[PDB]
Design an enzyme around this catalytic site. Structure first.
Site, PDB file in Angstrom:
ATOM      1  N   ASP A 102      39.131  22.996  16.783  1.00  0.00           N
ATOM      2  CA  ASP A 102      39.158  24.115  15.834  1.00  0.00           C
ATOM      3  C   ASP A 102      39.721  25.248  16.696  1.00  0.00           C
ATOM      4  O   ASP A 102      39.050  25.679  17.633  1.00  0.00           O
ATOM      5  CB  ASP A 102      37.753  24.473  15.301  1.00  0.00           C
ATOM      6  CG  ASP A 102      37.630  25.832  14.580  1.00  0.00           C
ATOM      7  OD1 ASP A 102      38.668  26.363  14.101  1.00  0.00           O
ATOM      8  OD2 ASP A 102      36.507  26.360  14.498  1.00  0.00           O
ATOM      9  N   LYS A 114      46.529  34.043  17.092  1.00  0.00           N
ATOM     10  CA  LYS A 114      46.615  33.320  15.821  1.00  0.00           C
ATOM     11  C   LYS A 114      47.142  34.239  14.686  1.00  0.00           C
ATOM     12  O   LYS A 114      47.709  33.745  13.700  1.00  0.00           O
ATOM     13  CB  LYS A 114      45.228  32.748  15.488  1.00  0.00           C
ATOM     14  CG  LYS A 114      45.177  31.855  14.260  1.00  0.00           C
ATOM     15  CD  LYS A 114      43.842  31.175  14.183  1.00  0.00           C
ATOM     16  CE  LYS A 114      43.700  30.425  12.919  1.00  0.00           C
ATOM     17  NZ  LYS A 114      42.426  29.665  12.893  1.00  0.00           N
ATOM     18  N   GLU A 119      41.608  23.910   7.759  1.00  0.00           N
ATOM     19  CA  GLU A 119      40.234  24.194   8.136  1.00  0.00           C
ATOM     20  C   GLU A 119      39.229  23.835   7.024  1.00  0.00           C
ATOM     21  O   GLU A 119      38.311  23.086   7.336  1.00  0.00           O
ATOM     22  CB  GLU A 119      40.094  25.654   8.617  1.00  0.00           C
ATOM     23  CG  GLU A 119      40.743  25.861   9.978  1.00  0.00           C
ATOM     24  CD  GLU A 119      41.044  27.284  10.393  1.00  0.00           C
ATOM     25  OE1 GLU A 119      40.432  28.219   9.831  1.00  0.00           O
ATOM     26  OE2 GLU A 119      41.886  27.466  11.299  1.00  0.00           O
ATOM     27  N   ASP A 147      34.007  30.698   4.351  1.00  0.00           N
ATOM     28  CA  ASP A 147      34.221  30.819   5.786  1.00  0.00           C
ATOM     29  C   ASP A 147      34.216  32.279   6.290  1.00  0.00           C
ATOM     30  O   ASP A 147      35.246  32.960   6.260  1.00  0.00           O
ATOM     31  CB  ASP A 147      35.539  30.107   6.163  1.00  0.00           C
ATOM     32  CG  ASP A 147      35.819  29.987   7.647  1.00  0.00           C
ATOM     33  OD1 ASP A 147      35.000  30.493   8.454  1.00  0.00           O
ATOM     34  OD2 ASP A 147      36.852  29.373   8.009  1.00  0.00           O
TER      35      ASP A 147
END
Ligand SMILES: Nc1ncnc2c1nc(Cl)n2[C@@H]1O[C@H](CO)[C@@H](O)[C@H]1O
Length: 385
Positions: free
Chosen positions: A10, A71, A175, A199
């Protein structure tokens, strides 16, 4: 041996996690400091390059040469309004190399510049070495996760980070898909299953709606806030304690960078305690001008301080349901992802919005994505033989 082994990674905005599926169980691998998650930070110093906890621990002393949020840049053009807006908030330099962003730093006394994929490859290399130290042999096959809204360019740059890191990338998976795999939600037999993944991480909030029809995954909707996470709740605690210090001592600490940082890390720790206790204590020796700051805070006060932020998580949930053209009763499963979903008030708000529904939260939420990626990596490497 190593050729029949695969890891699940992850690769998160603020934290990364690595897992391995072996002997019928997923093992989330602890790093050399015993932590199951590793900060997605890379520090460049006068003698070395630091990755993870060691990089996050010296961020105060070296802010210009400590890279994070790679990211947010990966797979994007320099001119992208997301890049231009984000650059104003980072202490490191972002430069333009033929419409591609590069992070520019000082390393061993020299000016060096890196593509976001080179930064992410250093995070991936660390996750690969953490798995190798646990397994006793080098592992190279990996499943790497990305947000469901990543386009082809972001997915390709993530796979490139994997190649630079020395990984054979079996697949780039979403994800929320990895999280649904962690809970075995694709093995319920026939008929379409609607899953909502909530999330809430350290710096981002994502809501995803998936349909699972006979093992096949389909993304129906994605919604959220790219600038909402656990760090905003830490900051609300900081503001409270800055005002309480002013009421007790008639002194403003907000300008003392060291006092604010020590208060921030203590607030983050107290926030975590508030997820399992109804009060947390702050114990800061000589916070400002030799004044100790020994205080406490209830979970009730913390919930009041973040009340508007917790409630704001329900607008993307409603937005995702309307985009997916689904009513609440049409959602079969609710999955929690991200460390911040451990906050009891957040769980209560989501559960009441879904009319008192049970939440899937038995897997450590900051580990569920790596867990699912590890499961997929085992299935994929077995089919490769
Ligand atoms: N027990 C907890 N109670 C509240 N917040 C938590 C908790 N654990 C983590 Cl991690 N976080 C936060 O989750 C993010 C990483 O996913 C960070 O913001 C961390 O503070």
């Amino acid at each position: 041996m190593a050729k029949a082994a695969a890891i699940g990674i992850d690769l998160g905005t603020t934290y990364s996690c690595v897992g391995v599926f072996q002997h019928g169980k997923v093992e989330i691998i602890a790093n050399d400091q015993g932590n199951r998650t590793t900060p997605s930070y890379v520090a460049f110093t006068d003698t070395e390059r630091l990755i993870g906890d060691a990089a996050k621990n010296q961020v105060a002393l070296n802010p210009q040469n400590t890279v994070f949020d790679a990211k947010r840049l990966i797979g994007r053009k320099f001119g992208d309004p997301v890049v231009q807006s984000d650059m104003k908030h980072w202490p490191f330099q972002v430069i333009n190399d033929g419409d591609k962003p590069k992070v520019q730093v000082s390393y061993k006394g020299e000016t060096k510049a890196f593509y976001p994929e080179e930064i992410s490859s250093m995070v991936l290399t660390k996750m690969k070495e953490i798995a190798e130290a646990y397994l006793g042999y080098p592992v190279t096959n990996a499943v790497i996760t990305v947000p469901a809204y990543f386009n082809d360019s972001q997915r390709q740059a993530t796979k490139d980070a994997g190649v630079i890191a020395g990984l054979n990338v079996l697949r780039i998976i979403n994800e929320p898909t990895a999280a649904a795999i962690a809970y075995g939600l694709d093995r319920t037999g026939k008929g379409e299953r609607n899953v909502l993944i909530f999330d809430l991480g350290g710096g981002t909030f994502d809501v995803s709606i998936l349909t699972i029809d006979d093992g096949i995954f389909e993304v129906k909707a994605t919604a959220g806030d790219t600038h909402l996470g656990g760090e905003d709740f830490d900051n609300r605690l900081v503001n409270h304690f800055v005002e309480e210090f002013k009421r007790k001592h008639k002194k403003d600490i907000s300008q003392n960078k060291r006092a604010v940082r020590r208060l921030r890390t203590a607030c983050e720790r107290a926030k975590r305690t508030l997820s399992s206790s109804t009060q947390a204590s702050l114990e800061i020796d000589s916070l400002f001008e030799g004044i100790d700051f020994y205080t406490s805070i209830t979970r009730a006060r913390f919930e009041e301080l973040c009340s508007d932020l917790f409630r704001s998580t329900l607008e993307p949930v409603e937005k995702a349901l309307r985009d997916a053209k689904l009513d609440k009763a049409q959602i079969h499963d609710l999955v929690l992802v991200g460390g911040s979903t451990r906050i009891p008030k957040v769980q209560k708000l989501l559960q009441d919005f879904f009319n008192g529904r049970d939440l899937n939260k038995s897997i450590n939420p900051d580990e569920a994505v790596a867990y699912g990626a590890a499961v997929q990596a085992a299935i994929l490497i077995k089919s490769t033989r």
